[PDB]
Amino acid sequence: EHLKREHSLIKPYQGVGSSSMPLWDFQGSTILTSQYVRLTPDERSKEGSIWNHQPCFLKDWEMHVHFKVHGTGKKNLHGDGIALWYTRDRLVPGPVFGSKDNFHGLAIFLDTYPNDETTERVFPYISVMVNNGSLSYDHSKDGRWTELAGCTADFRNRDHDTFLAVRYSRGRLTVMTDLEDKNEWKNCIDITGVRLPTGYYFGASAGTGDLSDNHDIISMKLFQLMVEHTIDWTKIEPSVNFLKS
Ligand SMILES: [Ca+2]
Ligand SMILES: [Cl-]
Ligand SMILES: [Cl-]
């Protein structure tokens, strides 16, 4: 395989129920079992996260995330969601799906509650954000101002496993979903001109506010992609270049 075990979270989770070294830190409301990592319980005002121990120096990679978001809150009465991160900093809790705002790097947000009273989107909504420290995620508008790309995705309270794939290679960022039990990656997001350095950390976080939900990570499997390259990659500033209209 091109699986990088050191950047993966897999049952039985290394170093947790044993003497070996763990590969992730568990932070905040996060709790372990043998079958999942629960970032938040179905309780209000929680923030939990997991952060990979080692910085990733792969230039080209694909993360497969087996997650589960589930709860008993009626109607639209659930929240807030999960974020996946490839960021300069790790372990800092905060208001952005459990983690710090004004981050450096990449976020993939799985947003389950529409804060935006005048929203056009259908939720739950998966979106991507690239940040160089300057941008703040605006909850009241569901991060509308800072979203690069996004898609509606029915990932909540499902009777079968739910997965997301996040692929990053040569400026191209692709997010795909497997939510329907078709054993198929369905496209959600596909953009180019994304500039991210090496040496950042993988992480996942979730938060709840006045509304709650269980947010579980079952596994995260990171694969190295076999990509020819013909420059200090740790010094790349996170940014996006845009095609002119
Ligand atoms: Ca929201
Ligand atoms: Cl692990
Ligand atoms: Cl279902």
Swiss-Prot record:
Gene Ontology molecular-function annotations: D-mannose binding; heat shock protein binding; metal ion binding
Membrane topology: Single-pass type I membrane protein
Tissue expression per record: Expressed in kidney, liver, intestine, lung, spleen and heart. Low expression in brain.
Entry keywords, A to Z: Calcium, Disulfide bond, Glycoprotein, Golgi apparatus, Lectin, Membrane, Metal-binding, Protein transport, Signal, Transmembrane, Transmembrane helix, Transport
Principal location class: Golgi
Cellular location(s): Golgi apparatus membrane
Cofactor binding comment, as recorded: Binds 2 calcium ions per subunit.
GO CC terms, sorted: cell surface; COPI-coated vesicle; cytoplasmic vesicle; endoplasmic reticulum-Golgi intermediate compartment; exocytic vesicle; extracellular space; Golgi apparatus; Golgi membrane
Binding-site positions, Ca(2+): 111, 113, 115, 142
Glycosylation sites recorded in the entry for this protein: 132
Chain sites annotated for binding a carbohydrate: 45, 80, 113-115, 139, 209-211
Domain L-type lectin-like: 1-225
GO biological process terms on file: positive regulation of phagocytosis; protein transport; retrograde vesicle-mediated transport, Golgi to endoplasmic reticulum
Lumenal topological intervals: 1-245
Disulfide bonds: 151-188
Subunit (UniProt): Monomer.
Function according to Swiss-Prot or TrEMBL: Plays a role as an intracellular lectin in the early secretory pathway. Interacts with N-acetyl-D-galactosamine and high-mannose type glycans and may also bind to O-linked glycans. Involved in the transport and sorting of glycoproteins carrying high mannose-type glycans.
Protein name per Swiss-Prot or TrEMBL: Vesicular integral-membrane protein VIP36
Organism phylogeny: Eukaryota, Metazoa, Chordata, Craniata, Vertebrata
Range within the parent protein: 52 to 301 of 356
